[PDB]
């Protein structure tokens, strides 16, 4: 994967997508 | 032979680390390419969703069909095959079920007759397969 | 064994235990020293002077008779050459091999032996620079080497 800051960016992107899915499911 | 001078410390330690990289277990532990190819990601256990049930054919001298399961792990999305040990224990598993999986015992190496299985099912629907097999508990769905 | 050859030979001198001047040798230290002075004025390296003194005049060792070795006597009076004898001979040999390689281009063995001679020249030059016999700015160069001899 390399490039520590880019690995952290990937982790932040996955966090954002999973949290968006969670909030979409819970509000219904 | 070896250098044995009183000033040969850095030669000795540099040659030691360079030839340390030629050790297979050391290179597995420290290069970091096996840890990212490992589906568990440095975890003792993982939890996944049953995709399908598989009959895996046993290797050449033994004739049996081992009941395994194709599971997709929740935390990374990778697909693994896990063996369901005891007899009739595949019947406790349904499709799209929540399953706790561990390794099978040889640290990522396939074991025994089963070709290409490194994992075994430990828990099904958050109850253990041992308690289901011995009939101590009941399974929800 | 050898520096640049596979040989391991034993050809060398063996001085006797006896350091005293033999009783038949009726030569004082001053006569031997003036003989060394006139042989150097004729023009000879200390190896040649020692060989002439040993063969003809019966002087077994100069430093057993005079107490001092030949090159130190020459340096003390002042007839020592500026470059040492062995370095001079090595540079002369290198010049001859360079002349041969200029004449003959396809001679690979001459190139190899020239490389060995240059390695020996550089080793001697480093040793003489450590002992302050040569100046520290001295260097052997490919083009201007025959001028030194």
């Amino acid at each position: 994967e390399l490039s520590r800051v880019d690995q952290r960016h990937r982790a932040s992107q996955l966090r954002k997508q999973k949290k968006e899915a969670v909030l979409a499911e819970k509000r219904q | 032979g070896k250098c044995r001078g009183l000033r040969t410390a850095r030669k000795l330690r540099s040659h030691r680390r360079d030839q340390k990289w030629h050790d297979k277990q050391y290179k597995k532990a420290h290069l970091g390419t096996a840890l990212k190819a490992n589906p568990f990601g440095g975890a003792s256990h993982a939890k996944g969703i049953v995709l399908e049930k598989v009959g895996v054919e046993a290797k050449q001298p033994n004739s049996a069909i081992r009941k395994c399961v194709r599971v997709q792990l929740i935390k990374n999305g990778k697909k693994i095959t896990a063996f369901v040990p005891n007899d009739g224990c595949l019947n406790f598993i349904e499709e799209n079920d929540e399953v706790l999986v561990a390794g099978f015992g040889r640290k990522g190496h396939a074991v025994g007759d089963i070709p290409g299985v490194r994992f075994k099912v430990v828990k099904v629907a958050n109850v253990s397969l041992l308690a289901l097999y011995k009939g101590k508990k009941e399974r929800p769905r | 064994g050898r520096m640049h050859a596979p040989g391991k030979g034993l050809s060398q001198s063996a001085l006797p235990y006896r350091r005293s001047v033999p009783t038949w040798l009726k030569l004082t230290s001053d006569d031997v020293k003036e003989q060394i002075y006139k042989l150097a004025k004729k023009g000879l390296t200390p190896s040649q002077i020692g060989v002439i003194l040993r063969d003809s005049h019966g002087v077994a060792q100069v430093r057993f008779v005079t107490g001092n070795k030949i090159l130190r006597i020459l340096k003390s009076k002042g007839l020592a050459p500026d470059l040492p004898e062995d370095l001079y001979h090595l540079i002369k040999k290198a010049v001859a091999v360079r002349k041969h390689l200029e004449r003959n281009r396809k001679d690979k063995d001459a190139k190899f032996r020239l490389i060995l001679i240059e390695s020996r020249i550089h080793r001697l030059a480093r040793y003489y620079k450590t002992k302050r016999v040569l100046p520290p700015n001295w260097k052997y160069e490919s083009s201007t080497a025959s001028a030194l001899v």
Binding site: - | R4, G5, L6 | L15, Y17, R19
Partner: protein, 129 residues
């Protein structure tokens, strides 16, 4: 080339003792070799020797008594402190009753027992038993 003349002398003594010989010629000689043989002689291990005094580095002919099993050098000459002499005598010596680490200290070349008596440390030279 020839490095560590003590190693050559001790190896020659060991090889000719293992062969059953009575005398050993070792060349060259040195003060360290003579001191080592003097220490090894005072414990009744080797016998008595002559230094052939040529005008070069001398030679030594040493008589052999059949009391020697192994005489050996340690290269390099490691620094040994008194706190660390016990580990060295555990590593090199066959028993606590016999065997000798020879070491050079500022009080001279001696054994490990005399080094303990005089409370000194130094650099290791050898061992014999």
């Amino acid at each position: 080339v020839r490095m560590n003349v003590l190693a050559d002398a001790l190896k020659s003594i060991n090889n000719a003792e293992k062969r059953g010989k009575r005398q050993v010629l070792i060349r060259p000689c040195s003060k360290v070799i003579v001191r080592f043989l003097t220490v090894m002689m005072k414990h009744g291990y080797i016998g008595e020797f002559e230094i052939i005094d040529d005008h070069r580095a001398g030679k030594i002919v040493v008589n052999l008594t059949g009391r020697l099993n192994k005489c050996g050098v340690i290269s390099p000459r490691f620094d040994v402190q008194l706190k660390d002499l016990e580990k060295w005598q555990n590593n090199l010596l066959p028993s606590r009753q016999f065997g000798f680490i020879v070491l050079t200290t500022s009080a001279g070349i001696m054994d490990h027992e005399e080094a303990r008596r005089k409370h000194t440390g130094g650099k290791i030279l050898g061992f014999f038993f």
